[PDB]
Write a protein that binds this DNA or RNA. Structure first.
Ligand SMILES: [Mg+2]
Ligand SMILES: [Mg+2]
Ligand SMILES: [Mg+2]
Ligand SMILES: [Mg+2]
Ligand SMILES: [Zn+2]
Lengths: 64, 129, 78, 102, 150, 206
RNA sequence: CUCUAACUAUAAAAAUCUCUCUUCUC
């Protein structure tokens, strides 16, 4: 199948990673807007973007 | 009760290669044993949350084909004389079990904790690293 | 230097009669025409690609969309 | 010289106590010198509380906690961030770090 | 023209051992071509390339040379492979050697046949090699028999 | 349409109905819409422009790169090598030729083809270097929509460049081929091939 | 002038180094 889902960030939880080049945000689904995840992003984001996810059960873990 | 056919999830999450192993109420009958190392490549991420996630999806699918619709979580650490703290993957395994339609009842921790260890491996000065 | 390309002549340096009927027959049915498109079909060297491409502006076989240098953009006459 | 008038052990009048093993490196360390941390936590964290609540029979099922007293080593305690080097006038203070949250 | 894979289908299976000739290396890994099967490309990643710590790739891979590998995932729509190299057991490499050697013999013989008859290897394999592999599992034993029993 | 008389005679087609700004006086910015919802607001079709050439201060703040016209960003990414680095009028001419070529092939107003190719050729999940030296790991992560736009433009122009290099086809023709192939999901396109291969790497390294 | 609640989770490898030291009295 093609379970491509979307998720609009509601807040950005600083920038993580050893490189210092990835960030961590709290995304909320376009559907069921009470269901949120924490996810890692690689690039410039701000409050308002719509990420595309091929997963929904994954949660972000701080990169070391 | 509305005829929720029950099983016990009985997760075993060591610091490597977590286990998801659902059984009936008695526990004498074993179905859908699929583990963490069953589904992931690196041989080092058998303990990773993604490993337990895929293992949990497989056991959920197999049990749903069986007819069991609700499960009882029995989280177990490696136990014994070992670290006996729950592994990283077991929590993801439980979350994915609760995701895939299955109903959840009576989470228990059943790690084998001793009245004392016989002897803990590593010598008096322990693992030097 | 290292002749590992192993390319041949691969280009009609001089146009031949049968190749003339070839250029004329698929002068249409080539819904987009350019010098590179013309030489893609092995039938033109590339200098005469411009010659044949310019000659086709004789009886309106193809129409120009833009006639900027360094290339050309031609479509079938409809 | 004495870096610690308490010698670190916190024994003062026993002579010998029974050692305990490190959780990480399994170092046979005396039970009073060893740093003990009581990890009381939730068997399912806030990351999945909503999911479990929606997908569980027995409405308003009080989910259980998990309790473990961890007997760290001391090299492990320095390395695993459990305990930190302190100022020589700050070593005086034995009260825990002031109630992380109220 | 060396094409028309040894087996009865052009695509791999999920667990098999294979042997590979490297063609190039990129930063994330190498998308290389399979020789146990005809030509289909697939990735070998650096994390699952070397046994020990990956200090060098030029010394280990030696692009343009032959190595053992296995296949973990398959793309059965247009053709893409995920392969592995560290998970080759001490017993795996030996049977990979023998399998590739017999395959190479049966390939070179029929390649000579195609070159002398100037007919594509596809038709020749479909007419000769495939029924023999069906009957006796591999055409080389059939060649030995034809040497002995006709 | 109401040709205004003046002492200077501007051509009629330049005077016809010019409350209807077109890109090169050939393509309408209306009728062009973004199929994907994630990459909207990071592809600038809203503002009409008469040229794909504007001296805009699109690199002063952090996020103004989005507000730059998408065709302008394609132009600016075409002018990428030492041999041709400052030359932008050449890039504008190349883009104009590519737009005409795309209009010829499957008319499908070429701005929509550009937008669709950019949507398709941008990866949705990527990797990052997280291994602690001793063990080399790539950790699968998600990409910002702005970085999706940037990366899509990057591979599109890179594929056009590598196709045009020591080849008979002009840079405009190769760019048009890449844009057309990336408008659909045709794996023959280099940009879409890199997109798919990077995404499947990231899947392999969850 | 009355008060005990929240939380995790990093240990790859790294050996050695030939000079020469100089005054404070208003
Ligand atoms: Mg140490
Ligand atoms: Mg000292
Ligand atoms: Mg102490
Ligand atoms: Mg006494
Ligand atoms: Zn210790």
């Amino acid at each position: 199948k093609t379970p491509v889902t979307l998720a609009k960030v509601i807040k950005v939880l600083g920038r993580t990673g050893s490189r210092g080049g990835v960030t961590q945000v709290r995304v909320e689904f376009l559907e069921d807007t009470t269901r949120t995840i924490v996810r890692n992003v690689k690039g410039p984001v701000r409050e308002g973007d719509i990420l595309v996810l091929m997963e929904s059960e994954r949660e972000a873990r701080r990169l070391r | 009760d509305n005829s929720q056919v029950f099983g016990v999830a009985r997760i075993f999450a060591s610091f490597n290669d977590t286990f998801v192993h659902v059984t009936d109420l008695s526990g004498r009958e074993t179905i859908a044993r699929v583990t963490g190392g069953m589904k992931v490549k690196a041989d080092r991420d058998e303990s990773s949350p993604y490993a337990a996630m895929l293992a949990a999806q497989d056991v959920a699918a197999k049990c749903k084909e069986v007819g069991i619709t609700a499960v009882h979580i029995k989280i177990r650490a490696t136990g014994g004389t070992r670290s006996k703290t729950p592994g990283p993957g077991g929590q993801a395994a439980l979350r994915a079990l609760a995701r895939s339609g299955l109903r959840i009842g009576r989470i228990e921790d059943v790690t084998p904790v001793p009245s004392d260890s016989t002897r803990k491996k590593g010598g008096r000065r322990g693992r030097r690293l | 230097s290292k002749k590992s390309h192993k390319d041949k002549a691969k280009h009609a340096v001089v146009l031949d009669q049968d190749k003339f009927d070839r250029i004329m027959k698929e002068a249409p049915t080539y819904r987009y025409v350019s010098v590179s498109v013309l030489v893609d079909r092995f039938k033109l060297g590339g200098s005469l690609a411009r010659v044949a491409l310019r000659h086709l502006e004789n009886e309106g076989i193809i129409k120009p969309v833009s006639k900027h240098s360094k290339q050309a953009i031609y479509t079938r006459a409809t | 010289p004495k870096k610690r008038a308490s010698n670190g052990r916190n024994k003062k009048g026993r002579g010998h106590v029974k050692p305990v093993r490190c959780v990480n490196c399994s170092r046979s360390v005396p039970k009073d010198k060893a740093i003990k941390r009581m990890a009381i936590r939730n068997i399912v964290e806030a990351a999945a509380i909503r999911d479990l609540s929606e997908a569980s029979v027995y409405a308003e099922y009080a989910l259980p906690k998990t309790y473990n007293k961890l007997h760290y080593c001391i090299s492990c305690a320095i390395h695993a961030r459990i305990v930190r080097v302190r100022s020589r006038t700050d070593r005086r203070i034995r009260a825990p770090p002031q109630r992380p949250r109220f | 023209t060396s094409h028309c894979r040894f087996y009865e289908n052009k695509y791999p299976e999920i667990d098999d051992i294979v042997m590979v000739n490297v063609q190039q290396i990129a930063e994330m890994g190498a998308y290389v071509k399979l020789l146990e099967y005809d030509n289909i490309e697939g990735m070998i990643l650096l994390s699952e390339l070397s046994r020990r710590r990956i200090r060098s790739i030029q010394k280990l891979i030696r692009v343009g040379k032959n190595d053992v590998a296995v296949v973990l995932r398959v793309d059965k729509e247009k053709g893409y492979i995920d392969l592995s190299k560290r998970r080759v057991s001490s017993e795996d490499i030996i049977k990979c050697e023998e399998k590739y050697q017999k395959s190479k013999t049966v390939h070179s013989i029929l390649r000579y046949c195609a070159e002398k008859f100037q007919i594509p290897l596809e038709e020749l394999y479909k007419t000769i090699a495939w029924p023999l592999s069906r009957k006796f599992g591999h055409a080389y034993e059939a060649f030995k028999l034809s040497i002995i029993d006709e | 349409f109401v040709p205004v008389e003046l002492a200077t005679t501007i051509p009629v087609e330049i005077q016809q109905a010019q409350q209807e700004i077109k890109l090169f006086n050939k393509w309408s910015f209306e009728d062009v819409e973004v199929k994907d919802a994630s990459l909207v607001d990071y592809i600038q079709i809203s503002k009409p422009i008469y040229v794909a050439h504007t001296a805009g201060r699109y690199a002063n703040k952090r996020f103004r790169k989005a507000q730059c016209p998408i065709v302008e960003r394609l132009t600016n990414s075409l002018m990428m090598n030492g041999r041709n680095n400052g030359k932008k009028l050449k890039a504008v001419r190349i883009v104009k030729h590519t737009l005409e070529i795309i209009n010829v092939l499957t008319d499908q107003n070429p701005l929509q083809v550009v937008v669709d190719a950019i949507i398709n050729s941008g990866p949705r999940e990527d990797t990052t270097r997280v291994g602690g030296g001793g063990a080399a790991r790539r950790q699968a992560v998600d990409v910002s929509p702005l970085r999706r736009v940037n990366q899509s433009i990057a591979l599109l122009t890179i594929g056009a460049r590598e196709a045009a290099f020591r080849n008979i086809k002009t840079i405009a023709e190769t760019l048009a081929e890449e844009l057309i192939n990336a408008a659909k999901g045709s794996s023959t396109s280099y940009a879409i091939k890199k997109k798919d291969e990077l995404e499947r790497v990231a899947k392999s390294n969850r």
